[PDB]
């Protein structure tokens, strides 16, 4: 089958690239993942869709953005935001985010138009990750470390 | 050698039980894991040692605490705090925490002279984990879930 030429994911807290569909994954495909809030009573979540292999979204390519508001106040980590990345056989990417507390959903359709990447630009972004692989490895391992509470 | 009747670990952010030595592990043994700070410029970490199988430390048994202070200012998640659990065959547990940036360390010995690992106490805490197996499973997956940023004001 065809494949995703670049990894696709979302920005998670701290400017982290969190991939839902990995580079060279077979397409069509869909991946569904549950996300939650960063702070108590957080009223909305920022959904920014990125493509690329680097560990931090500042270094990847923004494909689309939307906000989901109206989240009921709750302790951090309790709201459940269901995100689905859905790629068709032509590579067209639909992203849906749904607040399971109320059922309010938001969605974007990301097409394959003129501002998108060519084979050579795709190839260059692959090179970029390899050059920064060791540094990006440390960023990802940092994201994965458990956090300890403060003293006093 | 012996085996650890209960899991041993520390409380991580949010009151979470993070086990470093799993129940039924052969002892003596040593386990090392690196942790980091929860907030920007966090100047110290509180090391709270817990025993038990439940997902949250409030449901497990507190064994002791110590603080490691003197962490230099840095963004949240940047300091690297190495924690090592070292247990001997009689269940005596040493916990050391070391700031890898400065080499500053602190350490505690958790003695095993109370009778705390009794058949009846071990049995209850193992049964509890089974009884709350589904609830603790959803809690652990909830903790592991990625977080989305807040929106522009």
């Amino acid at each position: 089958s065809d494949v995703a030429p670049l990894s696709l994911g979302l920005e998670t807290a701290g400017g982290v690239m969190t991939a839902l569909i990995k580079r060279n994954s077979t397409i069509p495909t869909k991946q569904t993942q549950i996300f939650t809030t960063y702070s108590d009573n957080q009223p909305g979540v920022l959904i920014q869709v990125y493509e690329g292999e680097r560990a931090m979204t500042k270094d990847n390519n923004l494909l689309g953005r939307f906000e989901l508001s109206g989240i009921p106040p709750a302790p951090r980590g309790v709201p459940q935001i269901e995100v689905t990345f859905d790629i068709d056989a032509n590579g067209i990417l639909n992203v849906t985010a749904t607040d399971k507390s109320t059922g309010k959903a938001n969605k974007i359709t990301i097409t394959n138009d003129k501002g998108r990447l060519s084979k050579e630009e795709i190839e260059r972004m692959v090179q970029e990750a390899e050059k920064y692989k060791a540094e990006d490895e440390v960023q990802r391992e940092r994201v994965s470390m458990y956090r300890l509470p403060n003293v006093h």
Side-chain angles (χ1 to χ4, degrees), chain A residues 10-18 35-39 42 46 56 143 147:
Chain A
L10 288 188
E11 175 173 336
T12 55
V16 169
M17 173 69 171
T18 294
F35 299 84
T36 189
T37 56
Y38 185 73
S39 53
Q42 184 170 328
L46 177 61
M56 311 300 287
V143 172
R147 273 63 174 165

Side-chain angles (χ1 to χ4, degrees), chain A residues 8 22 50 71-72 99 149:
Chain A
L8 300 160
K22 288 157 184 45
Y50 277 88
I71 304 181
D99 180 357

Side-chain angles (χ1 to χ4, degrees), chain A residues 90-130:
Chain A
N90 286 324
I92 293 173
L93 170 65
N94 282 269
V95 174
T96 311
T98 305
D99 180 357
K100 296 204 73 56
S101 68
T102 60
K104 183 174 177 181
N106 211 2
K107 78 187 176 182
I108 43 177
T109 295
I110 302 167
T111 63
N112 273 16
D113 52 351
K114 284 196 198 181
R116 302 224 44 172
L117 306 183
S118 70
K119 305 288 263 190
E120 286 71 32
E121 173 62 21
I122 291 168
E123 187 178 344
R124 176 190 73 82
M125 300 188 60
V126 171
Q127 303 177 21
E128 277 195 356
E130 181 68 21

